[PDB]
Design a protein around this nucleic acid. Structure first.
Lengths: 101, 141, 313, 143, 206, 65, 63, 67
RNA sequence: GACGGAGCCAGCGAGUCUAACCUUGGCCGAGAGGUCUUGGUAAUCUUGUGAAACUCCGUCGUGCUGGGGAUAGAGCAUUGUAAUUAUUGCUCUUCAACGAGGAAUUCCUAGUAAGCGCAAGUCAUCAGCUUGCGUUGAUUACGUCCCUGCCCUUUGUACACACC
RNA sequence: UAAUUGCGAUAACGAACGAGACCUUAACCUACUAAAUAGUGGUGCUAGCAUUUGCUGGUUAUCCACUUCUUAGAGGGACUA
């Protein structure tokens, strides 16, 4: 019996929501308490860069953006369930981390 | 079960929470009374709903409002909107419908919307000018 | 039966209406302003009902509502895919019922008031409990389950219930909820079928829709009696608990008919000032009282007008 | 019927507690009370070169009463000023850390404010008490 | 007078002066009179206000600046000359002190002197530009009542600033003095002097 | 619109010649009908079904099972 | 002095070279049958009142 | 200027041309009807379709159309 | 309005691995700073970013005045291998042109113009710049084809390098 | 109509791009999911006061709720009704 905390940080939002739905379904499949999703804000990584090369023309700026979403869940699991929920719970690009205490 | 209710007013960023409980009559913002928050030239603007409705109804409600955001002006507008909403939400939930609607119509027949959130938000700054719609002056020659 | 006053306090179309069979003097009206409002009756010739409370929070239109007969539990079917159970005092949220993947359309309670019925625009007929778990999940209709109604069966409280339900896939189905199945099916409507009503004695159902043709099915021998030409869309239908009437709010007027024998008593028209002929304000919500002495009618323009029973001359 | 400081004003309580402090006198005030600026955001030493230490001490006692805990840097950020950068446009510059240090240490030498857990400085029981005794004075300012 | 006192005091001066009728800060909103035709529905004094700061939307539709209350429009007009844009609490403190000066100078209600002043200084016929081939003469035009109110308040404030600029005279004193002389015109006030010049150019260019 | 991002993909290549460089900007607009990740149509085509008629008179009477 | 107070019946159209003048008809507020074309300077609307010191002119297009 | 374009006008004429006896003059009911019988990609496009459809039904109960 | 105390109210943002990022809290320094730990790989700490305009009490009273602070001398710290041809910050002092800007000319129709500060980009240090963000918050229009331009039709042409 | 926007008129008919549709953000939502990296309430325990129950707090985990304000998913809403 241990007590872990998994943090899912990604930008493909519905892949995030689907892996968190997988996690909450596996957590209710053998319930821990309920420990539903805790939802951090959208960190917005905005860059403003000139559209123009070497400088002739009207001055234009594009604000390219990245939209990062962080979520995390506590769990009260055994170590074998920890290994399964770090291994068979995988997806492209979705950063998954399990911090223990 | 200590029949309280929490409501909320919202200016452009000044967001106030309003706690209303069945009490003795104290109206407080940031722990001090509303008579001791000091823009002082909007003091009658926050005095508006109380002496609007005639103060002998406030004797059984204690209200405490906390505001985050904005400036002095928008915080006074946030607290007056929030305690007026809390008054009419009390008179909806805990006493009669027509008392709620009577205070509601007496607020509508003066209102600066007074129980309604204003949709006025600041437009972004567009590039090419230090104003939101202003631009930098040009030379032509 | 001439008009006796004016009721206001809603902001949209007054959709539906109910009272309690023990205490006739309280009203609960559900209207298109996402809010369910109660009245007390005082019998004043200009302010006949006086507002008491309103239950709020719905993300869409409360379409239907019904109460129990001692004023204990209030049920509001609203198009935000839920049905809400309250008390008529303090408005506190007792039991939310979600589960319909599209808009709930009609709810009712039975005569013991622990089996809650909700017909829904996911083509389904759902029976939940007062707790909030589902007892019966019924498929069978091709299109929307627009209105459902329990029937008041025989006396002595038998352990057996019986229900009717319209469907704008052109059916009037009656279902037996002991083994959760159909018990009878009646056909003959030409257009989409909004409203159906069962009698006090549990053998007359009068059903109609956008046709203007009120067809009566007797569930005694399961026979089908006749059809009266209502000639416009019958917005709401009600059976009278004493005169055995068909009281119908229709797309131009309000036709009220006495069944035994075939004679129509009255063709009500409330007079307005300002609205025009192709812009008529029509009636939507109808309710008799529990004693059958007053009649409530809620309209598209927020208002409820009340009719009284009186002599001819 | 109950006395707290939030039922008297801010100007009037700060001036009343400054009058208390220059009445009771001994604070271990510094020697440079007429030399200094109070901030780098000022271009002239203050007008009342006499009792601004007592006004500053009264106001910071009120501020520490009002808050949870605070330090010398955040008191500098509070009492900073708008700086005339000359022809260059204005900014916000911090106040005198030395003066804020010696006034906070003087209220430590009374024991008005003390060191707090998780650092910084928090109000004492007797600091609240004497603040509420002068609040009792100002809530009996009505003759 | 039917008193009630609560936990927080909320003093009796306020509880008496405001509950029977809703005043200004402390000024008479009752018994005011606009003595003139063509100026009703363009002033606004019948629905009062507590203080003349208000959060109104007065641009999204066309004629709602007449629905805006009038001494608010006085504060809005005095917060200009872009060293002074956006200090509206300073401006409304200026009109509070101004109506104080009006009551200590005159026995009249100060909002009545405001109504009288813009009613008296609002010019009646202006003179607009024609294409004018050659000599470029200008046709006389009867100015609208909303522009009567607009140019009245505007010239009041321009006289306040340019008579208040380089002198020990402060803003409420100068605004009060232009307001009383534009109320009962003496032809010593810059507002009504500009009014008389507008009428002279309109007559001689008619 | 955002159909630029969804339903068409670009490919810009500088191609090196015997003389100076040429460039090819291939824009392939795939179907929305087989865009199996994303919405199955450009937001310009509305798909309706046609219904089935019913005979008018029908003799309104009762069946029983 | 003859300062005449008149009532707008109908507004007519935006004259002027620069496009800021309004042609208008005025009923006289005292007689119903004296209705005058008048060029007004600010914004005018229906149902409202005007001041005229020469209410007799009745001009045409301001070019 | 709220003038409806060819997608909304053509699709609303199509659903009233093959779906007259299903629809009504109710904005809420016809919004839910376009939910059921419309394969669309926007709630605002469906709202504008349903609004012009209620507009068309409100004049079609008063007379025909040339088309 | 300047100045001196006192009230005290924001939001988008950035932030160090095998090396010098944001730095809370105590200590001294008038100030700039330097020091001893604690906190952050960040809705966890810097942060309530306690920002400024604004607000109250008080001196100053029209004099190119204490407004403005340019220039210029002396010194103390910080960044850098390096600062003189000032990197920046600070202390003292010097107290200029500037008395509301000519002919022209620019931005703008609602939380919009304007005053007011902060973040971020380059960054060892340098923001008067810019990209964003918030605070206070208007007068005036709801038009026009007059001027400068645009689109459509009709017409004229000896113009097509197209009325320069 | 802002719109080659549509109604209509037709030697034109049926089409395509552009506009619109689309997408991001901004406003509302006591309505589902919630959260010691968000806030409240109550019981902790106590500080100052007047002590007439109270007020303003302090407490990183003392507990239990709670989701109104916060955050972000799934959705609602307006279509000139």
């Amino acid at each position: 019996i241990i007590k872990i905390r998994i943090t899912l940080t990604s930008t493909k939002v519905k892949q995030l929501e689907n892996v968190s739905s997988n996690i909450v379904k596996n957590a209710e499949q053998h319930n821990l308490v309920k420990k539903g999703p805790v939802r951090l804000p959208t960190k917005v990584l905005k860059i403003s860069t000139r559209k123009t090369p070497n400088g002739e023309g009207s001055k234009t700026w594009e604000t390219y953006e990245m939209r990062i979403h962080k979520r995390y869940i506590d769990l009260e699991a055994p170590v074998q369930i920890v290994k399964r929920i770090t291994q068979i719970t995988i997806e492209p690009g979705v950063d998954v981390e399990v911090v223990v205490a | 079960a200590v029949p309280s209710v929490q409501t909320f007013g919202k200016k452009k960023s000044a967001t106030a929470v309003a706690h209303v409980k069945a009490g003795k009559g104290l109206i407080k913002v940031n722990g001090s009374p509303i008579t001791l928050v000091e823009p002082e030239i909007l003091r009658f603007k926050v005095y508006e709903p109380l002496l609007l409705v005639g103060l002998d109804k406030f004797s059984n409600i204690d209200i405490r409002v906390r505001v985050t955001g904005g400036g002095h002006v928008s915080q006074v507008y946030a607290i007056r909107q929030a305690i007026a909403k809390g008054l009419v939400a009390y008179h909806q939930k805990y006493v009669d419908e027509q008392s709620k609607n009577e205070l509601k119509k007496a607020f509508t027949s003066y209102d600066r919307t007074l129980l309604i959130a204003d949709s006025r938000r600041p437009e972004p700054k567009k590039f090419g000018g230090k104003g939101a719609r202003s631009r930098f002056q040009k030379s032509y020659r | 039966l001439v008009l006796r006053g004016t009721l206001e306090g809603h902001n949209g179309w007054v959709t539906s209406l109910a009272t309690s069979a023990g205490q006739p003097n309280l009203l609960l009206s559900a209207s298109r302003d996402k809010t369910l409002i109660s009245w007390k009756l005082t019998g004043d010739d200009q302010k006949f009902g006086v507002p008491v409370r309103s239950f709020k929070g719905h993300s869409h239109i409360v379409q239907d509502c019904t109460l129990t007969a001692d004023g204990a539990y209030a049920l509001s079917a609203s198009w935000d895919k839920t049905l809400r159970l309250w008390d008529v005092a303090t408005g506190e949220t007792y039991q939310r019922f979600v589960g319909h993947k599209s808009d709930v359309m009609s709810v009712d309670i039975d005569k013991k008031a622990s089996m809650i019925i909700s017909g829904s625009r996911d083509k389904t007929i759902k029976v939940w409990t007062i707790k909030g778990q589902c007892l019966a999940t019924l498929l069978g209709h091709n299109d929307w389950v627009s209105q459902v109604r329990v029937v008041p069966n025989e006396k002595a409280d038998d352990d057996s219930v019986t229900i009717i339900s319209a469907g704008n896939d052109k059916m009037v189905k009656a279902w037996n909820l002991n083994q959760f199945q159909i018990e009878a099916d009646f056909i003959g409507h030409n257009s989409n079928i909004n409203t159906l009503t069962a009698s006090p004695d549990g053998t007359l159902i009068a059903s109609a829709g956008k046709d203007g043709e009120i067809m009566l099915w007797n569930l005694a021998a399961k026979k089908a009696m006749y059809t009266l030409s209502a000639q416009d869309e019958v917005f709401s239908l009600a059976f009278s608990p004493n005169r055995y009437w068909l009281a119908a709010a229709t797309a131009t007027g309000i036709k009220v008919f006495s069944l035994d024998p075939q004679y129509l008593v009255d063709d009500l028209r409330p007079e307005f000032a300002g609205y025009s002929k192709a812009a008529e304000p029509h009636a939507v919500s109808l309710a008799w009282s529990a004693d059958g002495q007053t009649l409530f009618a809620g309209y598209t323009d927020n208002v409820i007008r009340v009719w009284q029973v009186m002599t001819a001359n | 019927p109950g006395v707290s400081v939030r039922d008297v004003a801010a100007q009037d309580f700060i001036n009343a507690y400054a009058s208390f402090l220059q009445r009771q006198g001994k604070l271990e005030v510094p020697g440079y009370v007429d030399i200094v600026k109070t901030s780098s955001g000022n271009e002239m030493p203050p007008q009342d070169a006499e009792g601004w230490f007592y006004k500053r001490a009264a106001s910071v006692a009120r501020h520490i009463y009002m808050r949870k805990q605070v330090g010398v840097g955040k008191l500098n950020k509070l009492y900073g000023g708008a700086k005339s950068r000359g022809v260059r446009p204005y900014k916000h510059i911090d106040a005198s850390g030395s003066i804020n240090r010696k006034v906070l240490q003087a209220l430590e030498k009374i024991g008005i404010v003390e060191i707090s857990p998780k650092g910084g400085r928090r109000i004492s029981e007797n600091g609240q008490r004497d603040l509420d005794r002068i609040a009792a004075q100002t809530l009996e300012e009505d003759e | 007078f039917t008193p009630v006192v609560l936990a927080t005091p909320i003093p009796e001066e306020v509880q008496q002066a405001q509950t029977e009728i809703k005043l200004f800060n402390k000024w008479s909103f009752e018994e005011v009179e606009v003595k003139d035709a063509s100026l009703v529905d363009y002033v606004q004094v019948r629905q009062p206000i507590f203080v003349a700061h208000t959060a109104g939307r007065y641009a999204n539709k066309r004629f709602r600046k007449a629905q805006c209350p009038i001494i608010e429009r006085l504060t809005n007009s005095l917060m200009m000359n872009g060293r002074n844009n956006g200090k509206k609490l300073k401006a409304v403190r200026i009109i509070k002190h101004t109506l104080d000066i009006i009551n200590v100078l005159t026995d009249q209600n100060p909002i009545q002197v405001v109504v009288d002043a813009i009613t008296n200084t609002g010019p009646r016929e202006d003179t607009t530009r024609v294409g004018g081939g050659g000599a470029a003469r200008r046709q006389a035009v009867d100015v609208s009542p909303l522009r009567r109110v607009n140019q009245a308040i505007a010239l009041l404030t321009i006289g306040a600033r340019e008579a208040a600029f380089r002198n020990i005279k402060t803003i409420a004193e100068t605004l009060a003095e232009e307001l009383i002389n534009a109320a009962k015109g003496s032809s010593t006030s810059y507002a009504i002097k500009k009014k008389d010049e507008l009428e002279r150019v309109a007559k001689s260019n008619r | 619109g955002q159909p630029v991002n969804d339903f068409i993909d670009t490919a810009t290549r500088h191609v090196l010649m015997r003389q100076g460089v040429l460039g090819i900007k291939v824009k392939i607009m795939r179907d929305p009908a087989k865009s199996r990740t994303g919405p199955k149509a450009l937001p310009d085509a509305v798909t309706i079904i046609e219904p089935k008629e019913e005979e008018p008179i029908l003799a309104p009477s009762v069946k029983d099972y | 002095t003859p300062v005449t107070l008149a009532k707008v019946i109908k507004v007519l159209g935006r004259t002027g070279s620069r496009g800021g003048v309004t042609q208008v008809r005025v009923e006289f507020l005292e007689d119903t049958s004296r209705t005058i074309v008048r060029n007004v300077k600010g914004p005018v609307r229906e149902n409202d009142i005007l001041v005229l010191m020469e209410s007799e002119r009745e001009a045409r297009r301001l070019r | 200027g709220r003038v409806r374009t060819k997608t909304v006008k053509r699709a609303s004429k199509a659903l009233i041309e093959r779906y007259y006896p299903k629809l009504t003059l109710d904005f809420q009911t016809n919004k839910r009807l376009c939910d059921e019988i419309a394969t669309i990609q926007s709630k605002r496009l469906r709202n504008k379709i349903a609004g012009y459809t209620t507009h068309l039904m409100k004049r079609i109960q008063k007379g025909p159309v040339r088309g």
